[PDB]
Design a binder for this molecule. Sequence first.
Ligand SMILES: OC[C@H]1O[C@H](O)[C@H](O)[C@@H](O)[C@@H]1O
Ligand SMILES: [Mg+2]
Length: 750
Amino acid sequence: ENPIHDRTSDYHKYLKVKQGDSDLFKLTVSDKRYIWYNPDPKERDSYECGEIVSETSDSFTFKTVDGQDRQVKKDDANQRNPIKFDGVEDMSELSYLNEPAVFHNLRVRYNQDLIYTYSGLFLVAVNPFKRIPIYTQEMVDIFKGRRRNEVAPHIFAISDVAYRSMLDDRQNQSLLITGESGAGKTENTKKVIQYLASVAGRVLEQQILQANPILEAFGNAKTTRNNNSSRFGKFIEIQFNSAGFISGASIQSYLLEKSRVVFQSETERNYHIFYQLLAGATAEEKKALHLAGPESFNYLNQSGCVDIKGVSDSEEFKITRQAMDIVGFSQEEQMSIFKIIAGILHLGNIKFEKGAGEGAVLKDKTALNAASTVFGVNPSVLEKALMEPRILAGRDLVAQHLNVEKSSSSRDALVKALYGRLFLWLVKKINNVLCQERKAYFIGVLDISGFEIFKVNSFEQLCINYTNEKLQQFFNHHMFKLEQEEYLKEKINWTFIDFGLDSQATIDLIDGRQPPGILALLDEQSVFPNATDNTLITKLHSHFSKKNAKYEEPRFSKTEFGVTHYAGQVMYEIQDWLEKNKDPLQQDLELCFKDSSDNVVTKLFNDPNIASRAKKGANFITVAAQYKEQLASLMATLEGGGNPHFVRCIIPNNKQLPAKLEDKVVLDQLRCNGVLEGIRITRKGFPNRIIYADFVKRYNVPRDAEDSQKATDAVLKHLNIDPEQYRFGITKIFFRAGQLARIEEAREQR
Ligand SMILES: OC[C@H]1O[C@H](O)[C@H](O)[C@@H](O)[C@@H]1O
Ligand SMILES: [Mg+2]
């Protein structure tokens, strides 16, 4: 009748704790007390359960699994919770809050394939690495309209709360999904969009859903940490009208890792689309675009990996096209896109060799010709733009003759420019389909590239990790600093707590303007004509080595520097940072391609939104300077809207495998995310607070008395409730954890 109360239901099967049996009940009513302890003290995250057998005034004595006795100061003891709590849906409710206790609860739920658990006001999501049947339309219909208490933890539930808050307060909402690479941010992002598309839907809705398949084909790739890594960040606005139904959507993408098109580490892959087309193209297309297998192209055959376990690139290519068909990309538009993808691969097979002099020559023109043909440009113009670009020397026109290395770098620069502009064009084309009505409100979903560490971390990794560092500070800001400052404002005689979670020092080291940080010193070096990679790291060491605690000059290298992030220390290799920040492209290469006969290619080099570049003084804006501002604008939106809804995505292990929840990996993320601290603030504080005059409004009789703090003093007193669970502020009635949601449902039943 109602699937929630029906133990036969799929909702009870896949989203509720299984019923315990008679044997477990006898354990549950037992009076024995237990403790989480470390059998091996060096391994501080590995725990066993031990029974407390005696206690002194200041310590517990307990029995290990093997039978030996041990003591522990009660101040240092991690008590196990009464097992009745095992599986609790909100860990606010736990009696003992400690790392082994919190981890254990998630383990119990994970083992039953319950990946969602609440931690007070935010949702925790552990990556299952297997399909779970909790995202059907049936499950959507169940969560539709239900308040957070009534239903089990689900991404739908927090999406619904954000949707109801948008309309109850007439304010834009932010759903921010944190996590390191592979933790599940993109999967959950898509579930949020699925839910709101049906709950407030009315082909627009089909098209919204088809956008992300397109961008994942061109923006996602296999890394060592995730087989479907997002190599670009995205803020997605879901837009609604004043009535509350979907009006449209816009996507704001950030920092495509276009360097991946020309280089990939061992075991990795280029962007999916390359493998999709060559695998799934018709015989006409393969000849039209001079295609081959991935082993035939240098951009696809140097990593040693061309396929992903459990993925058919031939089938994904069918999926990719259908999404383009539904969104409205024409047949010749799509063919122009594939011509570009094809041309990039051919450009990469060009082999520059040494000529009679140091200047480079091109003895085989088979790749250049195939590229020129598909792009629709003059091969000899292109050839001369690659190896003989014209520059100005003062005002004089002088033709370079580049060597093999610099000819190869310019060709790479062209390839990364073509791919990044194609990606920006896809986003823009899509936004114009999905945005045809002035919004009334929106819910903005943030899905960034998550924290990652590799053997070699470069400029791209610092920008990625810096963004992850800023979102964590945003979480710290709202849960700890803003929460308490509202308490202080209302004079509830709360004395401040230091939760020891501040990412700001690391943030300032990266992006401070004065004292100038890494990104400022980078910019300075990028416009100085005698600068090199080694004058840059020398400058970074002098400013920060042994002067900033978040910075390390390593003793084992002369090209690496270490940044201590919330998620751990990262060591960055400085090679090529100047060129990556400047993002140069020979103008002769640009001139060649604006004469292209392909209408998509000509748009990528003539549309000023895609092709032109902002000047900050005498030079072009750098990549660092632009992105920093792009992100600052995004942060302004998030802080300007309603309070953010947080989903902390958690990776169970580093092997991308199901049913292996590892203790060290999980507790690392729980500590640096500030989960336990986020629980503590909810328990020790007053999360639910209400304006006096309208508490009576929603629930000597109650309503519109001259002053309601006098009234509610009476309402609560006459009523059956303790006065430690509320506090009288200047303008609000603060409530302790749970009181409001606990009580008013008796008002819902009365
Ligand atoms: O929350 C109380 C419920 O009943 C009433 O109809 C309210 O107006 C509506 O907001 C909700 O459906
Ligand atoms: Mg992702």
